[PDB]
Design a protein around this ligand. Structure first.
Ligand SMILES: CCOP(=O)(O)OC[C@H](O)CO
Ligand SMILES: CCOP(=O)(O)OC[C@H](O)CO
Ligand SMILES: CCOP(=O)(O)OC[C@H](O)CO
Ligand SMILES: CCOP(=O)(O)OC[C@H](O)CO
Ligand SMILES: CCOP(=O)(O)OC[C@H](O)CO
Ligand SMILES: CCOP(=O)(O)OC[C@H](O)CO
Ligand SMILES: CCOP(=O)(O)OC[C@H](O)CO
Ligand SMILES: CCOP(=O)(O)OC[C@H](O)CO
Lengths: 65, 393, 65, 65, 65, 65, 65, 65, 65
């Protein structure tokens, strides 16, 4: 017989690019990045404004159903 | 609500411044301032749960921060030284940005939360509860067909109770006009029990019409959803000075904070299930020959209990109310111045505001509230005076 | 079916450009950049007076609902 | 729904222009600049006589309610 | 026949938004987050002043009777 | 039926603004902040004299019965 | 009912202005301040002879029972 | 009740003017100020022969039991 | 896909020729080069009245979007 773990297309619409996961991972950097000027106050946490769209593309387009 | 634009435009005014111276021369140159003429936040589109009984409301808000002239112033113146130258123228113009003209109003950046005084939110909650318990609301979709077929039962009892007491007194000329007959027909019997058996067909269609509507209320109307809507807008003027813012311037500003509390609720009670399981006798399956004349009063036991239950206050249960928050007003600077230178126318500035937001949480006392049933129709109250004065007393 | 992680737009009105996040990150610089003249007393912490509105613009308009 | 981080106008009246922060940052220059004449004794730390009102006018004017 | 596990609307009025659960889960953060300044004394446990109203909305509006 | 977890207004008069919680949290900073001048002796623990009334306002006025 | 966390006025008379807390925090500065002239020997730790009465006034007079 | 942190007058007789603290702070300057003529050999460390009796008077006479 | 670090034209309007950077780099020379006649008093700091417009042209016109 066939498999029974899929056939509903539920996890794809929940954990994907066109869902809500991409919104909760884009504001997590500014939550600790724009407030750390009190302790460190340096130019170091600036390499995260480009790795958001790259990490989401190298993991979602692996299988693709 | 009023007219407001959402297109973000900009204007350039020279001073163418211154112147121168030284011377012459112157121258120177111137300035321118741018400056911005208006500003509009992002369109917040939200959804809610959709069941098979009632659609839940969804949060929605807009708001617009429009700025008129500067317013400127012257211163221167111258111176120178060186040387040369121176111258014166016033330157010195000094333009203002349209994204920061809400400092004179107790409104956040999202144009949703509005600071309501203690003398406004307290009066808006007492005027709504005083109308639901005393009986002052608007009917719904299911309430139109429910009260239409329920008033026909008490209406037909007018021509039956008044005609039943006329036989014991000795005035047969009044019962002929109520049973849709004619006063140009003589009688044959002389006893009080033989005159009623002559015009048997004069009340047979009236008996089937009672069971045609009674079986649809205690089995269909009392097993669905009866929504109710209450409209009450409360709006006061608040003048603030400033324581211053930037420048220183203181604003010196005015504002009109309005609120229309709309709470959706339905009829929910535990004693209403006892009257829905009761039965009624059938006049077609009972021979009226061996039954004496004293049977109409004993037959009105399940019917008379329904007329007295539709007048007592029945408690209700809330679901999810909406609290609208609309603020209207301007601010003139216233601115412062320076140184030285111277012258013155003197540099002035005028700005307008128009926000809108519907709340989610509702206000309802947890100790219960006796709500008057909407079945207090004029034609239904006349049946109670014909039973407790003649059929009982 | 669809997704269940969103459908309310609550985090968007709380963590965004037009929210209260831009007001708490603007006072953290003056709280430490304006008082460091005691030990350092130099012109070094002056580049943060323009990168506040730039970092919040390129990190929020990435997806856009 | 709406946000819950603001709506009180408490932090704005504390860290602002018409508050008490502007009074503590204005005495820090004379506390360390008028006493360093023992080791250096040179006109160097005098550029802060006008940049205090400018730094508070470029950061607070970003939002300013 | 029908089901017998419900038909009373009792658990919905007890464990919901308009109940008493939302009042006990809001004071537990200030009870332990505002007193741990004796050992840690840092800005770390401040990202929980917005996730309270979000977690209660993404779980209660799932079924909704 | 209704809920049974409330209806007494007991926790509101104990854990609130007009109770005793605001007093046990206002003297906890001076117990450890005004005594650490022996080892560290630095101007760092000064941002806590304004966040006491802010944290108690953004947590108590969330539900409000 | 009412609250049970107070009603004794014990912590107020122990941790306050007219108690013994103001004495243990005034000698901790001179204990390391007047003896650090060995290695450092510089005019630095001298601005703390005025912030003792200021910090206790913006910390004890916050609620005041 | 009353306070329990005092009632013994022990720290006052140990860390005060009429104690042994004033003696350990007057010999620390001559231990390093009178021997720094080897590498430096300048007239610089001479401002401490008058600030000893002043710093001990502006800190002990603050509360005074 | 394309890049996500630009597409807003925000940093170009802030750090450019037709912005505010050219105004803050022209008054820094007169702030100290015009008041140093007390110690030096020599015609030396006069070559900076022409290199301002040259340095801004050899750096901004390198890429040009
Ligand atoms: C007032 C904030 O000070 P910080 O930047 O946290 O200090 C860190 C070092 O201990 C001294 O710079
Ligand atoms: C200026 C960029 O610095 P980074 O390479 O991000 O970090 C180096 C050290 O860690 C500084 O702390
Ligand atoms: C006789 C002057 O003594 P001071 O002013 O204390 O020192 C001068 C500089 O510090 C030399 O470096
Ligand atoms: C002369 C004005 O002050 P500055 O330009 O800061 O001086 C730099 C050198 O230290 C000169 O001594
Ligand atoms: C506000 C929360 O973020 P912080 O803890 O201040 O910084 C993140 C890392 O823990 C650096 O310590
Ligand atoms: C001069 C006032 O005291 P501080 O600012 O603590 O001194 C630090 C260094 O000694 C300055 O060079
Ligand atoms: C402090 C230097 O003395 P002034 O008389 O101010 O200037 C004269 C020249 O600098 C030669 O030294
Ligand atoms: C005017 C530019 O030249 P200067 O800086 O005066 O240098 C030339 C010699 O060093 C004379 O001092």
């Amino acid at each position: 017989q066939d498999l029974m773990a899929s056939g509903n297309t539920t996890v794809k619409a929940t954990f994907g690019k066109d869902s809500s996961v991409v919104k909760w991972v884009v504001l997590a950097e500014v939550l600790v990045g724009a407030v750390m000027y009190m302790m460190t106050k340096n130019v170091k946490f600036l390499a995260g404004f480009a790795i958001i769209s790259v990490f989401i593309a190298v993991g979602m387009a692996v299988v693709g159903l | 609500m009023r007219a407001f634009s959402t297109l973000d435009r900009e204007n350039e005014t020279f001073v163418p411044s211154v112147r121168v111276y030284a011377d012459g021369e112157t121258e120177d140159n111137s300035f321118s301032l741018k400056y911005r003429s208006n500003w509009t936040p992002g369109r917040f589109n939200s959804t809610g749960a959709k069941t098979k009984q009632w659609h839940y409301p969804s949060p929605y808000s807009r708001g617009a921060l429009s700025v008129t002239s500067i317013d400127q112033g012257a211163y221167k113146r111258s111176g120178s030284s060186w040387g040369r130258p121176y111258e014166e123228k016033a330157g010195f113009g000094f333009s203002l940005d349209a994204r920061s003209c809400y400092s004179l109003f107790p409104v956040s950046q999202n144009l949703t939360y509005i600071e309501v005084p203690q003398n406004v939110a307290n009066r808006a909650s007492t005027e709504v509860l005083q109308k639901v318990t005393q009986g002052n609301f608007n009917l719904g979709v299911a309430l139109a067909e429910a009260r239409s077929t329920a008033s026909q039962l008490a209406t037909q009892t007018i021509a039956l109770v008044k005609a039943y007491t006329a036989a014991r007194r000795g005035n047969w000329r009044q019962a002929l006009r109520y049973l849709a007959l004619n006063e140009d027909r003589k009688f044959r019997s002389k006893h009080v029990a033989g005159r009623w058996l002559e015009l048997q067909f004069g009340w047979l269609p009236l008996m089937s019409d009672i069971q045609g509507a009674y079986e649809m209320l205690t089995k269909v109307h009392l097993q669905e959803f009866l929504p109710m809507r209450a409209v009450r807008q409360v709006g006061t003027n608040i003048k603030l000075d400033g324581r211053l813012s930037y420048p220183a311037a203181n604003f010196q500003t005015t504002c009109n904070i309005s609120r229309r509390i709309v709470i959706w609720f339905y009829i929910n009670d535990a004693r209403l299930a006892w009257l829905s399981s009761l039965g009624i006798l059938n006049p077609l399956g009972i021979v009226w020959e061996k039954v004496p004349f004293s049977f109409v009063v004993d037959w009105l036991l399940p019917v008379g209990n329904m007329l007295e239950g539709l007048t007592a206050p029945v408690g209700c249960s809330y679901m999810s109310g909406t609290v609208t928050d609309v603020i209207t007003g301007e601010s003139i600077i216233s601115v412062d111045a320076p140184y030285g230178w111277t012258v013155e126318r003197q540099g002035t500035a005028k700005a307008q505001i128009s926000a809108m937001h519907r709340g989610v949480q509702s206000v309802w006392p947890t100790t219960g509230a006796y709500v008057k049933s909407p079945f207090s129709m004029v034609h239904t109250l006349d049946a109670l005076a014909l039973i407790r004065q003649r059929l009982s007393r």
